[PDB]
Design an enzyme around this catalytic site. Structure first.
Site, PDB file in Angstrom:
ATOM      1  N   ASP A   1       4.922  -7.913  11.866  1.00  0.00           N
ATOM      2  CA  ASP A   1       4.555  -8.450  10.543  1.00  0.00           C
ATOM      3  C   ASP A   1       5.324  -9.710  10.247  1.00  0.00           C
ATOM      4  O   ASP A   1       5.783  -9.913   9.118  1.00  0.00           O
ATOM      5  CB  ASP A   1       4.709  -7.382   9.442  1.00  0.00           C
ATOM      6  CG  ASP A   1       3.992  -7.698   8.133  1.00  0.00           C
ATOM      7  OD1 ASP A   1       3.081  -8.583   8.137  1.00  0.00           O
ATOM      8  OD2 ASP A   1       4.351  -7.081   7.101  1.00  0.00           O
TER       9      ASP A   1
ATOM     10  N   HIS B   1       0.805  -1.219   0.000  1.00  0.00           N
ATOM     11  CA  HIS B   1       0.000   0.000   0.000  1.00  0.00           C
ATOM     12  C   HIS B   1       0.843   1.276   0.000  1.00  0.00           C
ATOM     13  O   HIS B   1       0.470   2.253  -0.655  1.00  0.00           O
ATOM     14  CB  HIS B   1      -0.940   0.003   1.218  1.00  0.00           C
ATOM     15  CG  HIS B   1      -2.389  -0.087   0.869  1.00  0.00           C
ATOM     16  ND1 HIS B   1      -3.100   1.024   0.442  1.00  0.00           N
ATOM     17  CD2 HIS B   1      -3.224  -1.151   0.918  1.00  0.00           C
ATOM     18  CE1 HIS B   1      -4.335   0.597   0.233  1.00  0.00           C
ATOM     19  NE2 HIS B   1      -4.458  -0.707   0.501  1.00  0.00           N
ATOM     20  N   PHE B   2       1.957   1.281   0.765  1.00  0.00           N
ATOM     21  CA  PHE B   2       2.811   2.463   0.921  1.00  0.00           C
ATOM     22  C   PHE B   2       4.293   2.208   0.618  1.00  0.00           C
ATOM     23  O   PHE B   2       5.012   3.155   0.296  1.00  0.00           O
ATOM     24  CB  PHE B   2       2.621   3.076   2.325  1.00  0.00           C
ATOM     25  CG  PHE B   2       1.171   3.255   2.722  1.00  0.00           C
ATOM     26  CD1 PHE B   2       0.430   4.334   2.251  1.00  0.00           C
ATOM     27  CD2 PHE B   2       0.539   2.329   3.549  1.00  0.00           C
ATOM     28  CE1 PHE B   2      -0.913   4.493   2.608  1.00  0.00           C
ATOM     29  CE2 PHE B   2      -0.809   2.477   3.891  1.00  0.00           C
ATOM     30  CZ  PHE B   2      -1.523   3.560   3.424  1.00  0.00           C
ATOM     31  N   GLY B   3       4.717   0.945   0.719  1.00  0.00           N
ATOM     32  CA  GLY B   3       6.084   0.508   0.461  1.00  0.00           C
ATOM     33  C   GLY B   3       6.255  -0.265  -0.832  1.00  0.00           C
ATOM     34  O   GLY B   3       5.318  -0.894  -1.325  1.00  0.00           O
ATOM     35  N   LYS B   4       7.467  -0.228  -1.380  1.00  0.00           N
ATOM     36  CA  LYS B   4       7.831  -0.906  -2.629  1.00  0.00           C
ATOM     37  C   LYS B   4       9.329  -1.246  -2.585  1.00  0.00           C
ATOM     38  O   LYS B   4      10.130  -0.394  -2.202  1.00  0.00           O
ATOM     39  CB  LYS B   4       7.464  -0.007  -3.848  1.00  0.00           C
ATOM     40  CG  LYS B   4       8.306  -0.189  -5.114  1.00  0.00           C
ATOM     41  CD  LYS B   4       7.587  -0.971  -6.209  1.00  0.00           C
ATOM     42  CE  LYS B   4       6.965  -0.080  -7.260  1.00  0.00           C
ATOM     43  NZ  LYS B   4       7.994   0.595  -8.100  1.00  0.00           N
TER      44      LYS B   4
END
Ligand SMILES: COc1ccc(OC)c(Sc2ccc3nnc(-c4cnn(C)c4)n3n2)c1
Length: 290
Positions: free
Chosen positions: A135, A19-22
């Site tokens: 996580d 969603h926010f990280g890559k």
């Protein structure tokens, strides 16, 4: 501490993205020849809010100070002028995640227990530095080689305050609820023991060889059903309170399953710690190795 220069970075392929990280694979080649090193670069999406931007800086700082044989190696940082933040440069783990690796490679029980032992050594180290992972899943465990595993995404990792035994989370839509302990789902409190529950789920994933049809969301969604309005989490909370758990994977020994169930104690204080798990898994691996 290290600074990577954007002019020598060459994108090879995308490795993963949320969603926010890559995370993408790059060749860092300051000679434009052969000697080029392979690096995994994590970037925050330029569209992410202030909470994610402050949390991104927190993540870089956690990894900047963490150093363990079973934790991903921080390389340095390079400016992301395109996103007005920083990019996190890490060493590239070429065999990838256990989630992508295990469905394609028949791995014996002995090796899987060695990975479980290594995960606990990296997690105990993280807990000794007073950080909770939040996580822990097979998708976040990276395979260096046949006998080396490393914990890889610290996107949700948090510092546990000095005066507290837990960290208050305040749940979002991206929470990995199928790897979460009841205290996380119900009270929004993440303890060190909450990471041990997630390890129990990780251990279950490893024993199922990360088969999608046997994955925690698949199995729990079969028990909850899919016509529950906004009550998936509530139905999961009550099945866990009734003592319902993920099944024993085919070919998982009884004692390994009992250890899994011990990580899944409803009462957080009845769970073993990562330090408690390390000699137990050392002895269980020695057993099955021979
Ligand atoms: C933004 O999302 C992520 C997601 C997973 C991660 O670890 C599993 C990381 S850190 C990291 C460090 C080194 C490395 N070498 N390969 C990979 C890699 C492979 N697949 N994926 C998804 C990541 N990594 N990843 C960041």
């Amino acid at each position: 501490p290290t600074v990577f220069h954007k002019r020598y970075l060459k994108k090879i392929r995308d490795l993963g993205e949320g969603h926010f990280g890559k995370v993408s694979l790059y060749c860092y080649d300051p000679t434009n020849d052969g000697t080029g090193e392979m690096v995994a670069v994590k970037a925050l999406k330029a569209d992410a809010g202030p909470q994610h931007r402050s949390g991104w800086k927190q993540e870089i700082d956690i990894l900047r100070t963490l150093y363990h044989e079973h934790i991903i190696k921080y390389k340095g940082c390079c400016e992301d002028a395109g996103a007005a933040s920083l990019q996190l440069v890490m060493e590239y783990v070429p065999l990838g995640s256990l989630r992508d690796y295990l469905p394609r490679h028949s791995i014996g029980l002995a090796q899987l227990l060695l990975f479980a032992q290594q995960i606990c050594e990296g997690m105990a180290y993280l807990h000794s530095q007073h950080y909770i992972h939040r996580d822990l899943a097979a998708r976040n465990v990276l395979l260096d080689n046949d006998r080396l595993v490393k914990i890889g995404d610290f996107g949700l990792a948090k510092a546990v305050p000095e005066g507290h035994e837990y960290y208050r989370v305040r749940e979002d839509g991206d929470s990995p609820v199928f790897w979460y302990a009841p205290e996380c789902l119900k009270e929004y409190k993440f303890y060190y023991a909450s990471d041990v529950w997630s390890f129990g789920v990780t251990l279950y994933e490893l024993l199922t060889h990360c088969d999608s049809s046997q994955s925690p969301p698949t199995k729990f969604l079969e028990l909850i059903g899919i016509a529950q309005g906004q009550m998936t989490v509530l139905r999961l909370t009550e099945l866990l309170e009734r003592g319902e758990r993920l099944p024993r994977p085919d070919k998982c020994p009884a004692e390994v399953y009992h250890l899994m169930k011990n990580c899944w104690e409803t009462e957080a204080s009845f769970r073993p710690t990562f330090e408690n798990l390390i000699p137990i898994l050392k002895t269980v691996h020695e057993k099955y190795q021979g």
